[PDB]
From a paper:
Although lacking the FAD coenzyme, the apo structure of HbpA has proved useful in providing information on secondary structural elements and residues that are missing from the FAD-complex structure. In the apo form, the amino acid backbone was complete from residues Ser4 to Arg228, Ala239 to Trp254 and Glu268 to Arg565. In the apo structure, the backbone Cα atoms of Arg242 and Met243 on strand β15 in D2 closest to FAD, for example, each move 2.5 Å away from the binding site in a superimposition of the two structures. The relative shift in domains is coincident with an absence of some electron density in regions in the FAD complex compared to the apo structure. These include density for the loop 195–203 that connects domains D1 and D2 as well as additional loops between the seven β-strands of domain D2, including region 245–249 between β15 and β16 and region 213–219 between β13 and β14, which features the short helix α8 in the apo structure. The reasons for the mobility of these loops on FAD binding are unclear; they correspond neither to substrate entry channels—as proposed, for example, for RdmE —nor to the region of the protein that would move as a result of FAD moving to the “out” position, as also observed in RdmE. The structural reorganisation upon FAD binding is also manifested in the orientation of the loop between residues 36 and 49 between β2 and β3, which moves to accommodate the isoalloxazine ring of FAD. In HbpA, helix α11 forms one side of a hydrophobic channel, the opening of which also includes the mobile loop 195–203, as revealed by the apo structure. The mobility in this region of the protein could mean that it serves as a gateway in HbpA for entry of the aromatic substrate.
The breakdown of the biaryl core was initiated by the ortho-hydroxylation of the substrate to yield 2,3-dihydroxybiphenyl (23DHBP). This aromatic hydroxylation was later attributed to a class “A” FPMO, 2-hydroxybiphenyl 3-monooxygenase (HbpA), which was isolated and characterised. Mechanistic studies confirmed that HbpA shared many of the catalytic characteristics of class “A” FPMOs such as PHBH. The monomer of HbpA broadly resembles the class “A” FPMO aromatic hydroxylases PHHY, RebC and RdmE of established structure and consists of three domains: an FAD nucleotide binding domain (D1) containing residues 4–76, 96–197 and 295–374; a “middle” domain (D2), composed of residues 77–95, 375–427 and 198–294; and a C-terminal domain (D3) incorporating a thioredoxin-like fold formed from residues 428–585. In this report, using a new genetic construct and exploiting advances in X-ray data collection time, we have used single crystals of HbpA to determine its structure in two forms: an FAD-bound form that allows characterisation of the active site, and an apo form that, although lacking flavin, gives extra information on the location of residues and structure of mobile loops that are absent from the FAD complex.
Numbering used by the authors:
A (entry chain B): 4 to 43, 46 to 199, 201 to 228, 239 to 254, 268 to 279, 281 to 585
B (entry chain A): 4 to 200, 202 to 228, 236 to 254, 268 to 585
C (entry chain C): 441 to 585
The structure:
Amino acid sequence: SAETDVLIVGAGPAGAMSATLLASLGIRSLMINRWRSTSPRSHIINQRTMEILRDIGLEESAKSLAVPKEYMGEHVYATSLAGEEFGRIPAWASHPQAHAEHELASPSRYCDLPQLYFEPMVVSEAALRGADVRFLTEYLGHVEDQDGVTARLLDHVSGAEYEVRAKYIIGADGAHSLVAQNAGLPFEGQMGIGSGSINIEFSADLSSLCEHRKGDMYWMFRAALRMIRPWNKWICVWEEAKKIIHEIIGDEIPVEVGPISTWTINQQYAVRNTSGRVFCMGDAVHRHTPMGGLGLNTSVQDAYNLAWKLALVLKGQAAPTLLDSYDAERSPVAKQIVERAFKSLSTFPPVFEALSLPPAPTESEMAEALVRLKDASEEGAKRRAALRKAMDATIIGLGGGHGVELNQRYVSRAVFPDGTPDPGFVRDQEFFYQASTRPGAHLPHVWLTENQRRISTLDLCGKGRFTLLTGLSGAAWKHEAEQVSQSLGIELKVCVIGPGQEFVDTYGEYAKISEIGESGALLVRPDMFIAFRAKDASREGLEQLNVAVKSILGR
Amino acid sequence: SAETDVLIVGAGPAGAMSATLLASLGIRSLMINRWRSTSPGPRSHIINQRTMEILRDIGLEESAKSLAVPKEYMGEHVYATSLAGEEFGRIPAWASHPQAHAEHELASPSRYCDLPQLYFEPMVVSEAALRGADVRFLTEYLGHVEDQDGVTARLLDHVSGAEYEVRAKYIIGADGAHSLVAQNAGLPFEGQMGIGDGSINIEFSADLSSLCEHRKGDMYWMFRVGVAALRMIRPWNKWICVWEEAKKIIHEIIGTDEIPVEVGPISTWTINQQYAVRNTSGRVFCMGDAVHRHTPMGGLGLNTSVQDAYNLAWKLALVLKGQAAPTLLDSYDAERSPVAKQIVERAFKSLSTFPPVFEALSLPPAPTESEMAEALVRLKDASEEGAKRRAALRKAMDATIIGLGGGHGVELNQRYVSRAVFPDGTPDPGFVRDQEFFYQASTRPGAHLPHVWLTENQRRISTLDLCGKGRFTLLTGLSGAAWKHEAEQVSQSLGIELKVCVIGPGQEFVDTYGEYAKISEIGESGALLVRPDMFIAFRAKDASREGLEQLNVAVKSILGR
Amino acid sequence: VSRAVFPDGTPDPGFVRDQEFFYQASTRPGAHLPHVWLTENQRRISTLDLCGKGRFTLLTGLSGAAWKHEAEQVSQSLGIELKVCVIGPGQEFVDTYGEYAKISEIGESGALLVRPDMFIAFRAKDASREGLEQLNVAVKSILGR
């Protein structure tokens, strides 16, 4: 037997990130994993995940191993890699305007970094920061009571079974989570919808076909060809029958075949992610197709939302009520993600409609469509246009869904409403991010300066602590904040932004972006979400802070 | 209880590398470690070409390069009063001198780089597990017993609390400098562990780009203990000082209050010069710091530990698969124990290069702020006495370079002599130039395969890239096609893989520059048999039938059959 | 070899290695000034960067401060500009690597007179008065005066 604070079952990206964050806040975690190693899957890393690595100080590492945005831009649709292109779309915000909306949304950027490298990076940091990490250990089951939970583990090295006592359990096993099964969580959706896919990993120098048109992926109508390491290591998606490959490249280039695997099509999510003392996290509560990068990025953000709350509760600085906001804030996102990824598969058939093709067409029918495309008639013009309209529409699954990625709007006991009407979105909320400074939104990024050197507004804010932001007219918040930290037992950094100060807004972006006068203030959560906002530093505003905080923490 | 082929105790660079390589060759390893994680502490960071070659064989080179600081940022070693104070002078460290750099480029396709063991370790531990090794941290080796069929060790699990047994065919002791595995195996050591009356390592953080970016180096040494060092961990930003808020010893070393400083952990180093005279004791093989414990002068610790693992894995693999007799494992001691003694003696001897600096300034060791100040102004003196002092100091400073990148020979000039190299009946050449300072390429058996550039599809490839992959390789020119057939016969005959490359104009690999012709000391029809670990075990002048007959014998001999 | 180089009495060394394939730095008059790295403000500067600018330049170490005064006297005397660089630990221009010491075939107090076109016209072993007297002659001679 053994005792710890939190038991994390699973060391995929969500469990690992959970361990890292709990270790960074002084909480004892034991992380476990049935398998011998990290996953040998996902690869698009979006801005929200990069911001979190930036908060933890792992951003520079990930960028070192990741392929940059500049190499991810050209999505090509073709007959084969060596054959003729139907056309290209500007993927992963490579279009100048998409890129601008990208830059303004965050200090971080897209990059490609196979889960294969990501996982061990984070598992090793978690152990470095203080988490205990044991692989080849299988969760068999648990029982809860009023004071905590006891789980039974099976050790695949020693052979022994032993018990672990813990105050909480995080179910971060994968898409077949036994932890979710035992906690009794309800799911909606199915796990094999219809055709799945076959994933042939392989190696081959394709620089001559790719360096003049750099992209993350190359899709063929005849299946996908995705880059793992620039122009060199690859998967094909669809034993020496894997010269299906030669067909997809379109013999001349030598090829070593790696492992092959199978994917199914899923659309299932948990309606509720918590069940007294058990919290479930990543693929365990949202299982979906790969369309859009959303799986890994959502999983890490699940862990970022929960850690700080658990920490606070385990230290008596907050009431267990606070843990309910994990479900309120995070379950919607899971449903959203699952529905989005599936819906993104509908954007492909319309490509065949534009070529007048049935699905699974035959080499003849294809060949006809290709020459109709080259036709100098008005019928051929219509086709050309139809194909364009169709191809452009696929972009939602391929970098255009910026709104889905960033426009979280939490509503829970952990955000204190300011009395403002919910504004909607001016533009489409799946395609476009809308910065909001209203409570429940994520803190907008703008550039300030510290010592004439650019710093993001987000760099003022993480570090496992609440932060409160203001201008010079709002010095009063400094004193009001100290009083509240003293009164309730919690850290509360206060930044006064302006001309004299450490942080100044040399560009006026902070003034422009907040929807609020200089003397107003934003209370930012450890997870970077705004929990409270005041118009000004009036005494009515200043009295509210202390209440907002007691309320947020359940006290 | 549990069973596995090899039990590796320790997950420092040698144990981890061992696990990776054995997993890559299809061998079941369990690697264990007392601690909760990889080494956090300030330890090794200079990665030399031999270690980079090995990563290049394993395909981890591009990863390490991504996280490592390049050679170009490592060049300026400055000696000064303080970082903000006045420089006594600079030497061109880590082969930054144009000529040192040429000798570097020619010696290998790889390059120096700085990568804190802190990142190196987890890189390799995760690859080992990915390639098939079982890896368990928080597990302590308590002891073992051997017999005729293998070994049984007792382990203590610090998570579950349980003790259990592990049965294995062999054990690799890669715990550190206090190896309990070495103690139980009964290995003999020579040398001591605390030589005199050591060093304190203060980790800290602070943006020093204004003081360093115009003169990029790995280290900045201060004469002020007489001496203290300031080493870069992440370019201009994360640091250790070497020598609780008394750690503004630091402010003294930087020489200013103005730059804000966050203090990290502090630790202590001692001066060691101790190595094992013998690294093997029936069925137990000891590996890194466990058999060579020494000071940090020259980068040699980590690099030697990884190469210990590269020498052994393939041999263990062959033996465990019945392709080789247990005799082959004796060459680990023959080939590797000398290098341990060499490394330890070199690192310690590199500390003698410092006192002569004080002699050149007429200073006693541990001088006082006044005496120092006098020496500085004598140095600036427009007299002939002052000229002599200047020159003395130069002669002294230059001599320290052996510990700071000049020891290229120590790094690369291994010459194995063991049952695992088959002599060709060439006279031993010596070294034309100093064998500590200068690498000498040799193609004679027992030497490491030289690097030269060939082309595959008009693209440069190293001779070394034809050669690892856990297998023996045989190299030749077109006049030597006969070796192809002879090689097949021997692979069929004994049960082992044996790649053959015929280098030339028509072929896959060609030597577009003539470097292969120039470098081998051998005619086109001759051949080199290269080991998995990149060392030449056999060489033939030509492809005559007398030469061709020998191959089969050399191979049966090397493998003990 | 011409009236515009003042021989220092040193035998011509030859070339150790083939003179078509390999450069040999020399500091003997008639040769081109060798390059080595010095520092100005801890930033690398070439020895050649001390030296052009349409003017004669004279190079020395600290033990050679006497050349500063001697040089001024000669500029005043004949009507020409003559920069003087004293290379060393205190100064503008220091040889942080010791290359200057290593490369010149000359003690610290010695000096090299470099022509506008970067060729050495005069070299002195040291700053003795016999050496210092020569400068004025070397210069009159070089200019035909």
